[PDB]
Amino acid sequence: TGYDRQSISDTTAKILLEVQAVHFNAEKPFIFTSGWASPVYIDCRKLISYPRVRRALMEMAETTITRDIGFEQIDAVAGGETAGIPFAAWIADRMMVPMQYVRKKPKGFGRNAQIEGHLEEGSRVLLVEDLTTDSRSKINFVNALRTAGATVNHCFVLFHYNIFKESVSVLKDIDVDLHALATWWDVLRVAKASGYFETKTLDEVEKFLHAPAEWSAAHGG
Amino acid sequence: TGYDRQSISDTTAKILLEVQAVHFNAEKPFIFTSGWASPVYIDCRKLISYPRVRRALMEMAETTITRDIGFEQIDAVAGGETAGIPFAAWIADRMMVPMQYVRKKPKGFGRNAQIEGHLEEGSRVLLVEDLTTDSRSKINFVNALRTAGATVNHCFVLFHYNIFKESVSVLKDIDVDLHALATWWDVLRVAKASGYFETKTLDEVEKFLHAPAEWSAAHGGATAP
Ligand code: NA
């Protein structure tokens, strides 16, 4: 699958396109429950349904983690509910460490109402999610972990939008480093080189990537 | 971890006690938001946090599935959101098949509204959950899968209470067979044999397993979970 960051980015973008976890539509943009308009759409949940694909992604996740964080810095892996859970389960297995998962909302009240699994005080926990857009929803999960006694300095996702400043800075501002396999820039570059898409389509995707909030406003949102 | 149903039931029960996924308390029972009162409590979600335990559980799950269902009867494994998901992820991996998961509630429209992942029309799907009490919440998940075009004839859980009279038939009535590693009866058997518990505690657990609603009503609770 590749050891270096660049081959992992490439292979991951190719996979996202190969099984159409990524879709483009310049003519009829994707409209989101939040009222965002976009010519791009990704569903990383799709990836769980392809045995060879998910294996490769999990192999590359473990490589990314051990390369950029280390081999013995993580005592447990916690998945964000829901879409982070399958990936957390596989990464936890590969890393031979305890798994937890973190509920979006507490069940009851207490320093532990969002944590499922056993979490030892002092454990260094890696937060795993499928993707990040602007990382705002990660603050909840990081907080639940820290309140429950965990040390959290890293978050891993498969896919990092990398089009909003916030995706890195919201995490850095609460002392968490972001790690990922690929971004929209990797998808765009592979898509271009492939020859499979119309220039009109990729032109629009690129426009969105450079200024997505403005692009949304000019096409709907 | 063993190949026959008896040794898998004993090993699973021992695991549940070893990491205290199971707890007993007869004098100060567990009181649920329904007001149900029980001297027993189980949290299967704790099992995901023990690397050797979860490996044994998943090996035993794969054995149970291939022994009692077959080797080529399943095209995909779908976990019930949320506690089913980790176990479905590991079982899908072991079986070398696509995974999906099933939402409690549909999101948006279309045949696949209640499914996440990719589900090929015609796929024979195994529903996976951590546990079942009376199996009533399972009907939703089987429906969701059938609506999306799956064939579903089997549901697998780690733990089947086996104290409420419909927990098998409510599924059999909709042409689904329940498969499980262990029950409360297995937990009681191993707990008694271990010598680790007070006699009074196990006597009360036993009374509860035999007549749960009655026990609940006599010890502070309501008549239904
Ligand atoms: Na869906």
UniProtKB/TrEMBL annotation, chain A:
Assigned EC number: 2.4.2.10
Cofactor: Mg(2+)
GO MF term (any one): orotate phosphoribosyltransferase activity
Catalysed reactions, semicolon-separated: orotidine 5'-phosphate + diphosphate = orotate + 5-phospho-alpha-D-ribose 1-diphosphate
Residues of the Phosphoribosyltransferase domain: 56-159
Enzyme kind, highest EC tier: transferase
Claim: Nucleotidyltransferase is one of the keywords in the record: no
Top-level taxon: Bacteria
Alphabetized InterPro entries for the sequence: OPRT, Or_phspho_trans_dom, PRTase-like, PRTase_dom
UniProt keywords, alphabetically: Glycosyltransferase, Magnesium, Pyrimidine biosynthesis, Transferase
GO biological process terms, semicolon-separated: 'de novo' UMP biosynthetic process; pyrimidine nucleobase biosynthetic process
Pathway annotation from the record: Pyrimidine metabolism; UMP biosynthesis via de novo pathway; UMP from orotate: step 1/2
Residues the entry annotates as binding orotate: 133
Binding site for 5-phospho-alpha-D-ribose 1-diphosphate: 103-104, 107, 129-137
Family recorded in the similarity comment: Belongs to the purine/pyrimidine phosphoribosyltransferase family. PyrE subfamily.
Self-association and partners: Homodimer.
Function: Catalyzes the transfer of a ribosyl phosphate group from 5-phosphoribose 1-diphosphate to orotate, leading to the formation of orotidine monophosphate (OMP).
Protein name (Swiss-Prot/TrEMBL): Orotate phosphoribosyltransferase
Gene: pyrE
